[model samples]
Target: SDKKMVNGAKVTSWTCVSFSTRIDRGLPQEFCKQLIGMCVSKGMEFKPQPAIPFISCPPEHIEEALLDIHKRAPGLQLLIVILPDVTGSYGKIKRICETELGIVSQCCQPRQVNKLNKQYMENVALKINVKTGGRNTVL
Candidate 1:
């Protein structure tokens, strides 16, 4: 557990899983969809409007961590910031949509839904706010 905080406020941890897949390019989408399909088959209800995405099982089982962190630190946004590992998997992309993008989409109008663009990959150390709770803005 690489859990640490500078002023006992912000906390972070590293949970690395080893797998032999090309986690780059177009591989992530297939991997993520197949994983989600498994969870659906097993009855993990897909909450379309979930606060966050890709935190569930049949995938990586990060929901518990997400909830735990949210409980421990309320108000502050909770994010499952993921970086591309060697496996070329887009599991993180799925999760981000479920959690972050979904959160943004919830506030959009019916017509605006089609106008919004989905994010595929972002470099590390970048901060992006897709919505302001009432509107969407890419930063």
Candidate 2:
């Protein structure tokens, strides 16, 4: 907290979704909630809490889920999608998120959901801020 980061994202609107099938429903939400806190702590111009909130869904329904959110919150600036514990889902999410929906998104691995490593979340905040047209370096 001592050092001032540069060009924090003005993320006035954002949301999160989890494609995990973990038995504990609270895990993914916890990840998103804590992640949001990290972003704000790192100086993103975001709400202390999410307005669109978080949702859990199956991997096959990724497209439908995103479409629903798009209609509901047209002004959404950023999205944090917690990926399933598998690897093949990224390409699909990337195509739909970037090409079809034109929304900027960050995909997080489900392993970190249960762990919530401070460094991982901090690193994620930096990437996310840059994706939102901000930067992490003062240089």
Candidate 3:
């Protein structure tokens, strides 16, 4: 058995086998459809609303949508795309997906960096590396 201790807990060989994302309304409809098809082609499930433009709807509405899908398929892993301005709500959304629905929710986004926020740039870089399966080099 191959195992190691991380912060006093056992760690084993675990790597991400599936990935998915929630497309925001801001994205082109055609692009969203294509992305959904691509994800499905890769053996991932598509679980968002077919008509809803964005995942960042009212919390209750989002919860209902998530609950409905989860009821049908209990073991769904999801990656949610978020805009920069909605960073504050990330924790809430993540909690809902993880605690309420038992879905693993990972988040990422396309971003633009300006000189005023060097720290933000570094954070985004770290996220990119981790999401792409590269070792984090933000130290």
Candidate 4:
């Protein structure tokens, strides 16, 4: 799918959270780096910083981690969250992030996250790019 890219979108502020205890801590950061590279290739504007700090915590601590990061990064553009191994956590996370915190977020399954597949990352970047005011030429 050769789609149009974001000509100029600012996704400068960002932070991340990891609720899954099984995956390696650094995988999320690596994923962010690769995603940023992919977005840049797609013509989005990005500055290489933040290294996307990841806060690892238990499922219940997700809010705590998010709030902590929010305090550290005011007006965070994106919050990439790795969901816990258990199911049914998406609603809670989304509720806290979207309705309460009023922050945009993406929750990924741990299994899908550890793979680091290029295509998968491209998909994520697509969603992120659009969310941050980028347009798509072809669907």
Candidate 5:
């Protein structure tokens, strides 16, 4: 029954981490709205919150951000998507999460990678301690 807090809010702490000029493209607002809509359409309780954007950083920082999120929410499920703009950086990020972070359940898909209308982008969902103790901690 271990709960976590972020910015003073009590959340399952599930988060979608991404790196992109979403502000320029205005993707943050659109994506957040879409996510909330999806939950509502499914009759799920989803509160529309602000999307967290990590801006003005190098490509490597993107990896760090993802890892940090994973560490924060070790019991939550994570889905990570890398936008196509990262060139080959996506591969590196994926590798680190898998090999270094021991995040086996985590998935990394390119922006071009999508399922039907759900296009992959710079994002990931983190699930921690879902199984039991000895859960993933590396990132």
Candidate 6:
């Protein structure tokens, strides 16, 4: 087991990871709150914001944020959560995070379920579960 001494206390490798999500009109406030709340309940630290993470930021400010993250923790991995419909701004942020910051970034999007089809939904769920390393509950 990987361990580290932090603030005179021993912490494990799992404690090194951080999780957060970006919000916009594309994702409902309730959903964001619920998701963040769930993470908090599971002992994850999250800072709430008023708008989409870097999408609402000015270019210079966005760069500063990225720079700070890279400088502070060069090896930190980031899992960026965004809505699928926010392709314009989120796309640029993702590019900069990966290219300029040299960070290992993974983007996950929560999509809307517009219409329901039993078999189609099952297949889609199975595929997503497999890709994300989640156990398939669809039969």
On TM-score, the candidate that comes out on top is 4
Off by over 4 Å in 4: 6-8
* TM-score, ranked from best to worst: 4, 2, 5, 3, 6, 1
Candidate that would win on lDDT: 2
**What's the best-to-worst order under lDDT?**
2, 4, 5, 3, 6, 1
**Can you write out model 5's per-residue Cα lDDT over 33-71, one digit (the tens) per residue?**
564354333233333442233223345576677676567
Question: On residues 1-139, what C-alpha lDDT tens digit does candidate 3 reach at each position?
Answer: 1221111211111111111233334443433344444433323344444422233444335556556555554544333333344346567656876677676444544332112244443443334333333343212
Residue pairs in steric clash, candidate 3? none
Worst 10 residues of 1 by lDDT: 120-129
Give the lowest summed-lDDT range of ten residues in model 3: 9-18
Q: How close to the true structure is residue 83 of candidate 1, measured as C-alpha lDDT?
A: 32
Is candidate 4 or 5 superior in TM-score? 4
Preferred candidate (lDDT higher): 2 or 3: 2
Candidate 2 stretches with Cα past 4 Å from truth are 1-4
Model 5's TM-score against the true structure: 0.46
Off by over 4 Å in 6: 1-60, 79-87, 107-139
Residue 10 local lDDT, model 1: 19
Q: How far is candidate 4 from the true structure (C-alpha RMSD, Å)?
A: 1.8
Off by over 4 Å in 3: 1-60, 79-85, 109-139
Question: Candidate 1 residues 21-77, lDDT tens each?
Answer: 223333333433343233333223232222433332222443444444344434333
Clashes per candidate (backbone, < 3 Å): 14, 0, 0, 0, 18, 0
Model 2's TM-score against the true structure: 0.88
Model with the higher TM-score, candidate 3 or 5: 5
What TM-score does each of the candidates earn? Answer: 0.26, 0.88, 0.37, 0.89, 0.46, 0.35
Please provide, for model 6 over 1-139, each residue's C-alpha lDDT reduced to its tens digit, 9 standing for 90 to 100: 1221111211111101112233333334444445444433323344565222333233335455556656665544333333343444566556767677765443434443222233433343333233333333312
Return the lDDT, model 1, position 134: 17
